[PDB]
């Protein structure tokens, strides 16, 4: 159920525009996914229901900006 959180953040805000190369997908996806998913376990709770509110914009913007900028 992590397709909505990872697909509704990089393909909506602007996190996937900085890493459009094919070689950066493994390091950016593994580092951002493992660092963002391991540093915050509450974000998975957003996949337990609907979303599209303050938790989706705050968790997606902070997790996408911190995970995409700290990789």
């Amino acid at each position: 159920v992590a397709q909505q959180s990872l697909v509704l953040f990089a393909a909506e805000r602007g996190y996937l525009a900085d890493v459009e190369l094919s070689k950066i997908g493994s390091f950016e996806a593994a580092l951002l996914a493992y660092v963002d998913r391991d540093h915050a376990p509450l974000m998975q709770e957003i996949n337990q229901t609907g979303g599209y509110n303050d938790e989706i914009e705050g968790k997606l913007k902070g997790i996408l900006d911190s995970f995409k900028a700290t990789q």
């Binding site: 580092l31 493992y34 660092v35 391991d38």
Partner: protein, 52 residues
């Protein structure tokens, strides 16, 4: 000019050193987590192989 150049060089050196230390700590933590996940995956694969 000397104060701004020394402050910019010291801030750039401190930021590059802190970013390198944070990247080394993140790489070491990622390597240790990958080793623990590989050991847990090997133990789970051995237990599943024994049960199978």
């Amino acid at each position: 000019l000397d104060l701004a150049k020394a402050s910019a060089t010291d801030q750039l050196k401190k930021a590059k050193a802190e970013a390198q230390v944070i990247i080394e700590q993140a790489n070491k933590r990622r390597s240790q987590i990958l080793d623990e996940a590989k050991a847990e995956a090997e133990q789970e694969r051995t237990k599943i192989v024994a049960q199978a």
